[PDB]
Amino acid sequence: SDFYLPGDYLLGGLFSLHANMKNFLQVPMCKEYEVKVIGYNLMQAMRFAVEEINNDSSLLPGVLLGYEIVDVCYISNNVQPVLYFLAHEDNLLPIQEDYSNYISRVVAVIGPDNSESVMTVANFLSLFLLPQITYSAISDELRDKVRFPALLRTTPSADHHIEAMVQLMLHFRWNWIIVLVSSDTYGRDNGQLLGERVARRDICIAFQETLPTLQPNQNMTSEERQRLVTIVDKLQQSTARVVVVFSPDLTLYHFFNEVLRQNFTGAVWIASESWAIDPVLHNLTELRHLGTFLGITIQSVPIPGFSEFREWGTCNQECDNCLNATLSFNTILRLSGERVVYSVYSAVYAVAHALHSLLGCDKSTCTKRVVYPWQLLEEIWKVNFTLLDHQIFFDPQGDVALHLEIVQWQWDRSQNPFQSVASYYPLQRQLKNIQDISWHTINNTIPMSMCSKRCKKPVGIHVCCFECI
Amino acid sequence: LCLSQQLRMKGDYVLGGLFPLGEARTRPSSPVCTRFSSNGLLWALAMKMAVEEINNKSDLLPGLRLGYDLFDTCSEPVVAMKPSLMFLAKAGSRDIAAYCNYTQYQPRVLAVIGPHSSELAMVTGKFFSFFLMPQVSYGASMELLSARETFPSFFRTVPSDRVQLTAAAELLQEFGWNWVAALGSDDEYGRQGLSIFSALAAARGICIAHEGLVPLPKVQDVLHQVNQSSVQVVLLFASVHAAHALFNYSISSRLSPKVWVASEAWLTSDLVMGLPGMAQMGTVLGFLQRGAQLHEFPQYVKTHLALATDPAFCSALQRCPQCDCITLQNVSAGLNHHQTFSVYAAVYSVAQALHNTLQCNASGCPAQDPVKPWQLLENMYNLTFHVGGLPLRFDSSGNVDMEYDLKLWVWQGSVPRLHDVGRFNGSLRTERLKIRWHTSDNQKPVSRCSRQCVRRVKGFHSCCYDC
Numbered sequence A: 001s002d003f004y005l006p007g008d009y010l011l012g013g014l015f016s017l018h019a020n021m022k023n024f025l026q027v028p029m030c031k032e033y034e035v036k037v038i039g040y041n042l043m044q045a046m047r048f049a050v051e052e053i054n055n056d057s058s059l060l061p062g063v064l065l066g067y068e069i070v071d072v073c074y075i076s077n078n079v080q081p082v083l084y085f086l087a088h089e090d091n092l093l094p095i096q097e098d099y100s101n102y103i104s105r106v107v108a109v110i111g112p113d114n115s116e117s118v119m120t121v122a123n124f125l126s127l128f129l130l131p132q133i134t135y136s137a138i139s140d141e142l143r144d145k146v147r148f149p150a151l152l153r154t155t156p157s158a159d160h161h162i163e164a165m166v167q168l169m170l171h172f173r174w175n176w177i178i179v180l181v182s183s184d185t186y187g188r189d190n191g192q193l194l195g196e197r198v199a200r201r202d203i204c205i206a207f208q209e210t211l212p213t214l215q216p217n218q219n220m221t222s223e224e225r226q227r228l229v230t231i232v233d234k235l236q237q238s239t240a241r242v243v244v245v246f247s248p249d250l251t252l253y254h255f256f257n258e259v260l261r262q263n264f265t266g267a268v269w270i271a272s273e274s275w276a277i278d279p280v281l282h283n284l285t286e287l288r289h290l291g292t293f294l295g296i297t298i299q300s301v302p303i304p305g306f307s308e309f310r311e312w313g314t315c316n317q318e319c320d321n322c323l324n325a326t327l328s329f330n331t332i333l334r335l336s337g338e339r340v341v342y343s344v345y346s347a348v349y350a351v352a353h354a355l356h357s358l359l360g361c362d363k364s365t366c367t368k369r370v371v372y373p374w375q376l377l378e379e380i381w382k383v384n385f386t387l388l389d390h391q392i393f394f395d396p397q398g399d400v401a402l403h404l405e406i407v408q409w410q411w412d413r414s415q416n417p418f419q420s421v422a423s424y425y426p427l428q429r430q431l432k433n434i435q436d437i438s439w440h441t442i443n444n445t446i447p448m449s450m451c452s453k454r455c456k457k458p459v460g461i462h463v464c465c466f467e468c469i
Numbered sequence B: 001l002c003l004s005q006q007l008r009m010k011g012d013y014v015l016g017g018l019f020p021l022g023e024a025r026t027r028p029s030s031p032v033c034t035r036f037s038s039n040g041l042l043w044a045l046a047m048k049m050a051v052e053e054i055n056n057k058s059d060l061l062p063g064l065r066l067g068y069d070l071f072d073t074c075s076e077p078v079v080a081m082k083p084s085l086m087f088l089a090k091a092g093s094r095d096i097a098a099y100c101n102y103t104q105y106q107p108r109v110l111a112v113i114g115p116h117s118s119e120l121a122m123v124t125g126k127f128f129s130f131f132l133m134p135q136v137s138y139g140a141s142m143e144l145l146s147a148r149e150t151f152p153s154f155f156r157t158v159p160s161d162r163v164q165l166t167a168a169a170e171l172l173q174e175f176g177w178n179w180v181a182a183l184g185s186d187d188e189y190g191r192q193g194l195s196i197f198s199a200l201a202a203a204r205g206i207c208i209a210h211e212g213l214v215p216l217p218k219v220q221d222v223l224h225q226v227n228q229s230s231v232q233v234v235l236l237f238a239s240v241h242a243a244h245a246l247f248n249y250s251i252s253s254r255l256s257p258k259v260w261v262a263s264e265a266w267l268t269s270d271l272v273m274g275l276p277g278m279a280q281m282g283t284v285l286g287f288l289q290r291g292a293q294l295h296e297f298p299q300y301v302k303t304h305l306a307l308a309t310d311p312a313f314c315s316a317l318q319r320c321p322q323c324d325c326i327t328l329q330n331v332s333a334g335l336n337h338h339q340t341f342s343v344y345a346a347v348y349s350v351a352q353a354l355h356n357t358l359q360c361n362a363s364g365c366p367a368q369d370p371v372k373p374w375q376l377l378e379n380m381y382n383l384t385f386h387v388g389g390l391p392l393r394f395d396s397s398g399n400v401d402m403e404y405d406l407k408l409w410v411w412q413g414s415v416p417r418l419h420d421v422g423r424f425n426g427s428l429r430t431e432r433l434k435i436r437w438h439t440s441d442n443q444k445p446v447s448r449c450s451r452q453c454v455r456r457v458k459g460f461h462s463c464c465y466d467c
């Protein structure tokens, strides 16, 4: 199938093909959950990268790069895939004091898409030092290499995301914002990080409220109804008109339906990377009256021939509804470009270049020596090449300097569903090249979010709040 | 001393063990810890005593020998991952297969006595949940380990942080302080405590004036923010080091007295208790665990350490090479440790679950095939086991339930001592007629915000109104 391509060296791939969109003795397989199109798109990106690598006679010549892609759920199943990657061809994993001479089934793994499963996989692989390049993982806890020696990345961490948010906030002169986080760890960490970063730059937070966990397509308890009503009522009562939402893309459906029902209009919603590029959420098309939506996500890079490639196409390794689900999203996915697809492309190309250097071949036959995972990890820190007119090299903390971008959701099926308005360069931590933004105001003026008109005695904890004298 | 040779004992149903016996890479090698820790050795001896006295018992596990494989795990999880993988390997072989699901495994260990550290407990629990291995832990208290979605086979013997946080929230609500400031350590412990307490407060009507984090040895800014609001109650859900650092800095700045609500981390610790000048910072109202203790454990430790030096015993009879060159004075300090009872009760609970699973009666045990580890989970939830004559029960979410004692620091001769002023057992009861407050007279400090009134919303979660 498309989950397996034999070759000289394997390449594990963990992708979120399903999510919990609604008894411990039986284990529900990930095939029974609702299909996520984003995961299948990312897997197609990895497969396209591997096929393009195989085509080329310059990169890894004479060595077939194979891969064993397995389906990882968002949280549910993230142990069996690692156990299967680490095992031999006989599905047996020896236990020994030293793994220097041990050769595993896969030479590297393209890590999961969320921080928690990435942490679990890295904790399991730290013994074997199997290289693991995650995409779209933003937790700052993975930056340090004391406890994650074998973890790398291809996306800027949450530090750069928060910096981009604060730079955009300061550019348009908003110093009165509302922060919403989800009950999960990711939302809490991101909200705390944003609060700490923003408290020293003369921008105050009106309040922070936590959305209850509420997966869509389910009957939610009246207690959650009351909680959502209270949160939206507090949003409406407050004078702040810039709401920053830090939550996974699944738990926002009920919240946005509640906001739509309450007819709360006139806010500049700022998205995290979780849902800044969510196509199924953007398909609602009834959020145009909620104001303007922005979001932080990886800079678009047009990968040639990926759209045509996508269109032409053991356990927990097969999904059937994915094709028929992604067929309906072909046009929007094609027009939206490639943002995280480029992250997966870069991860695979970095692994290939590391293997190319480790084998030590140049435009001719390779030495075809045995490759231990730790050797590949050692040689992968030094990769440096130009991929699609971008620079790919790893920081001392295993990060790739890829430019972020603030996207403004514009609803036009004939054009790009995620128009890009600003570019952020992580290397200098400066946000620049801000372009025209189609605001929700009457005369296309910048929305004003300030708790005090400029005058001076202070009132309340927040420094930015006062009454003119 | 031939102590390490006793870390492994054969039997019909061996048990697992993950203890902090020792403390503190460009190659895939498991690091070795050489420094010796007394707490881990004492807990290992406690579990060994529990297993041996269970084997001594006749009406519990009759005709079956209970084994154990005590393993040294440092605080790091990298060293501790190898013992878990050795646990899940089939008996008689050193290889662990990667099957589709748990039903095809035949692990060599019936259960696991999980790690003391909570992060290590999370790692090991997430690993074992795939195989549905029943793992009971001592000392692991952080709350998200109770999520049965991702930890279907993790139990514990110490109450979770939710219990003490609910007790603190009930104390704040009953005394009438609905305008409080919450703090926590920058480590995972403080962040988790704060996340649970925000929800508990929002449910109970209270909510936070300022929710901050105190970094481990910034704090000046956190104290400034706390001082900005007119809040007389501060809940410091922090570890010992963060609490001590905050108190030292606030002493340096001569902070006004406040009512500090203390977690179990620093409520009884002598690092802050003995801090000079601490008496000028209000009454410390904390919740402390109300649990029994192994009365005969010090006698067992001393007699076992005396007997292990006899060469004849060692001849008759590594995981912890540092455990050999020790003396009784190197472990005498932690003899009266609370966690020894937690380990003893965890071992007793696993033994009782095994006795129930085989459906054994007093005379003996029916003969059948060995019971798989996942078969214990049915009889581990909703299980009542007697430990030292005191009944205990495992919740449907897998946490033991036990009472708490509300204590406050009573100052006398610069040597504070604890006193009983309340008892939490799911519904707090307090005796406020005997509480000595810190104000000018013996009057309860008032920290109240008006929820109704002209109004100007105030608070971190936008609850109150500055009428």
Ligand SMILES: *[C@@H]1O[C@H](CO)[C@@H](O)[C@H](O)[C@H]1NC(C)=O
Pocket: A025, A026, A027, B100, B101, B103
């Ligand atoms: C476990 O996997 C086996 C593979 O043969 C399957 O037959 C069985 O139904 C599975 N059990 C589950 C998922 O509970």
Ligand SMILES: *[C@@H]1O[C@H](CO)[C@@H](O)[C@H](O)[C@H]1NC(C)=O
Pocket: A051, A052, A055, A305, A309
């Ligand atoms: C090159 O890759 C493309 C898809 O990227 C595939 O259709 C083709 O078979 C490969 N080989 C050649 C020789 O075109």
Ligand SMILES: *[C@@H]1O[C@H](CO)[C@@H](O)[C@H](O)[C@H]1NC(C)=O
Pocket: A219
């Ligand atoms: C509950 O679920 C049912 C079945 O899907 C659905 O028809 C209904 O709208 C839901 N809500 C209520 C309030 O019954």
Ligand SMILES: *[C@@H]1O[C@H](CO)[C@@H](O)[C@H](O)[C@H]1NC(C)=O
Pocket: A261, A262, A263
């Ligand atoms: C907006 O929603 C509110 C809340 O249900 C409703 O009362 C109102 O009629 C709706 N329409 C307008 C124009 O306000």
Ligand SMILES: *[C@@H]1O[C@H](CO)[C@@H](O)[C@H](O)[C@H]1NC(C)=O
Pocket: A283, A284, A285, A328, A329
């Ligand atoms: C998007 O929303 C429209 C309008 O409600 C609906 O017809 C369609 O099924 C949705 N999904 C798509 C286009 O994938």
Ligand SMILES: *[C@@H]1O[C@H](CO)[C@@H](O)[C@H](O)[C@H]1NC(C)=O
Pocket: A320, A321, A323, A324
């Ligand atoms: C997709 O739907 C079409 C009809 O729209 C059907 O013919 C085809 O079999 C479906 N493919 C699946 C369910 O994999």
Ligand SMILES: *[C@@H]1O[C@H](CO)[C@@H](O)[C@H](O)[C@H]1NC(C)=O
Pocket: A384, A385, A393
């Ligand atoms: C990678 O190569 C480019 C192009 O030669 C060079 O400018 C850059 O400094 C190199 N990066 C590192 C980290 O050496």
Ligand SMILES: *[C@@H]1O[C@H](CO)[C@@H](O)[C@H](O)[C@H]1NC(C)=O
Pocket: A442, A443
């Ligand atoms: C919007 O701009 C136009 C053109 O300058 C002007 O005539 C109109 O009065 C403006 N409207 C408002 C509400 O300021």
Ligand SMILES: *[C@@H]1O[C@H](CO)[C@@H](O)[C@H](O)[C@H]1NC(C)=O
Pocket: B049, B052, B053, B056
């Ligand atoms: C078990 O009983 C024996 C006598 O049968 C005794 O020597 C030993 O100390 C006991 N072990 C305990 C109480 O742990």
Ligand SMILES: *[C@@H]1O[C@H](CO)[C@@H](O)[C@H](O)[C@H]1NC(C)=O
Pocket: B227, B228, B253, B254, B255, B256
């Ligand atoms: C704290 O607040 C009080 C009351 O507003 C004030 O007297 C004092 O200067 C503030 N600062 C410190 C460092 O105590």
Ligand SMILES: *[C@@H]1O[C@H](CO)[C@@H](O)[C@H](O)[C@H]1NC(C)=O
Pocket: B217, B245, B248, B249, B252
């Ligand atoms: C206490 O704070 C003072 C003043 O900042 C500092 O000099 C001292 O080192 C601190 N003590 C400890 C034990 O951290």
Ligand SMILES: *[C@@H]1O[C@H](CO)[C@@H](O)[C@H](O)[C@H]1NC(C)=O
Pocket: B036, B322, B323, B325, B326, B327, B329, B330
């Ligand atoms: C036993 O105690 C002595 C005296 O403090 C100490 O030097 C020695 O290291 C201890 N043994 C250990 C820690 O194994």
Ligand SMILES: *[C@@H]1O[C@H](CO)[C@@H](O)[C@H](O)[C@H]1NC(C)=O
Pocket: B360, B361, B362, B363, B364, B365, B366, B367
């Ligand atoms: C207890 O178990 C034994 C061993 O199987 C059996 O012979 C006996 O009948 C059972 N019942 C009693 C009351 O002893």
Ligand SMILES: *[C@@H]1O[C@H](CO)[C@@H](O)[C@H](O)[C@H]1NC(C)=O
Pocket: B382, B383, B384
């Ligand atoms: C199982 O739990 C139920 C509900 O809490 C309780 O009534 C029952 O006694 C429990 N079974 C036991 C303790 O054997």
Ligand SMILES: *[C@@H]1O[C@H](CO)[C@@H](O)[C@H](O)[C@H]1NC(C)=O
Pocket: B425, B426, B427, B428, B429
């Ligand atoms: C809890 O303690 C109260 C008194 O504070 C008592 O009345 C009640 O029965 C106790 N509940 C339990 C379950 O022990």
